[PDB]
């Protein structure tokens, strides 16, 4: 009923019983504040739970707030449901007890599915603007002070100066002088036509260079833009590692890793490459936008020091 005229929102349907442990009842209109519900795209129930946890209670899942194993979130055949699996979530009321000393109204918030306003400590009706960052999370890098609405960046010049012969562009069409270009998009004039929300098709071949030319809209905060881009890093940028020639390069649009999922996904990708850096060329106008650059894919065993990329991201976003 709240899911009327939606083909791909099973993640939201599977979340209903998890959210109900914290008294939450999402209306269609409230669901519509999640971008991928509004545009009806496939998603991670887990990332959306973390997004909703922050908006409602001002805390992300590393708070332990939904760490009670009450309701399963299970993915069978690209379909999220509540079928038994050892991946279970639900309001953890011992954590609510621990948190209540610092946050007195929080127990009532999670009992009645109301927003705990981390500024006032008072209860509000659902509004995605009230809690913009998780207060429990120590951000690995600085976020931009101000954001502006700029035209889309043109990365044609940056990709043309990368080393390699065969490019796969994923998302928005990109011209690359001097290289062989295949194009992955849901546009019908694409070399490979597919839904990008289901990820890189397994049957896509291997390349020297993969460029993820996929953007995510800014709405409320750098933190929001980042967590909304997290599923694209997972479905496109991470899967690109299966589509690379040995020593190949993956470059991806991104917004840092303000959220836990982005930080984990970026760290998992980085271990597959000899070199990992964050670049912001002159072409990149939108202030939150960076390029993640992964060079020398070799599927070796290697340790990743996140402080390297975090340092670079802090410099870029603070203008240091
Ligand atoms: C999963 C998805 O949306 N699956 C659909 C589904 O079961 N729906 C549509 C919306 C409510 C629910 C229902 O009516 O029971 C199914 C009909 C599509 C074949 C979605 O594709 C997803 O997020 N996959 C996981 C992404 C990795």
Q: Quote the distance from N terminus to C terminus.
A: 50 Å
What class would the helix/strand composition place it in?
alpha/beta
SS strand fraction: 15-25%
Q: Taking strands numbered 1, 2, ... along the chain, how are they ordered across the largest sheet?
A: 9-8-7-10-11-13-12
Q: Outline the biggest β-sheet.
A: 7 strands, mixed
Question: What general outline do the C-alpha atoms trace?
Answer: globular
- Helix percentage: 25-40%
Instruction: State the helix count.
Output: 10
Q: What string gives the helices and strands in order?
A: HHHHEEEEHHEEHEEEEHEHEEH
Q: Indicate the radius of gyration in whole angstroms.
A: 20 Å
Give the number of domains: 2
Extended strand count: 13
Which cofactors or ions or other ligands sit in this model?
Answer: [propylamino-3-hydroxy-butan-1,4-dionyl]-isoleucyl-proline
Main traits of this protein?
7-stranded mixed beta sheet, Protease nsP2, 320 residues, 29% helix, 13 strands, 10 helices, viral protein, two-stranded antiparallel ribbon, binds [propylamino-3-hydroxy-butan-1,4-dionyl]-isoleucyl-proline, globular, cysteine protease, alpha/beta
């Amino acid at each position: 009923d709240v899911f009327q005229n939606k083909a791909n929102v099973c993640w939201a349907k599977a979340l209903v019983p998890v959210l109900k442990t914290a008294g939450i009842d999402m209306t269609t209109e409230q669901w519509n504040t999640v971008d991928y519900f509004e545009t009806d795209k496939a998603h991670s129930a887990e990332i959306v739970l973390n997004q909703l946890c922050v908006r409602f209670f001002g805390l992300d899942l590393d708070s332990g707030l939904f760490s009670a194993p009450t309701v399963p979130l299970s993915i069978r055949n690209n379909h999220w449901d509540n079928s038994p699996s050892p991946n279970m979530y639900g309001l953890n009321k011992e954590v609510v007890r621990q948190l209540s000393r610092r946050y007195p109204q929080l127990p009532r918030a999670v009992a009645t599915g109301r927003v705990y306003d981390m500024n006032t400590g008072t209860l509000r009706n659902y509004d995605p603007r009230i809690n913009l960052v998780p207060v429990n999370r120590r951000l690995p890098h600085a976020l931009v002070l101000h954001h502006n609405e700029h035209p889309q960046s043109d990365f044609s010049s940056f990709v043309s100066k990368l080393k390699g012969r065969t490019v796969l562009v994923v998302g928005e069409k990109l011209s690359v002088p001097g290289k062989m270009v295949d194009w992955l998009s849901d546009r019908p004039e694409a070399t490979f036509r597919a839904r990008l929300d289901l990820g890189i098709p397994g049957d896509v071949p291997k390349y020297d260079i993969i460029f993820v030319n996929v953007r995510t809209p800014y709405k409320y905060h750098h933190y929001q833009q980042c967590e909304d881009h997290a599923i694209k890093l997972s479905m496109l940028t991470k899967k690109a590692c299966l589509h690379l020639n040995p020593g190949g390069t993956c470059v991806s649009i991104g917004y840092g890793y303000a959220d836990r999922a982005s930080e984990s996904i970026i760290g998992a990708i980085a271990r597959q490459f000899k070199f990992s850096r964050v670049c912001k060329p002159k072409s990149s106008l939108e202030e939150t936008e960076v390029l993640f650059v992964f060079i020398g894919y070799d599927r070796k065993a290697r340790t990743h020091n996140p402080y390297k990329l975090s340092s670079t991201l802090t410099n870029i976003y603070t203008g240091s």
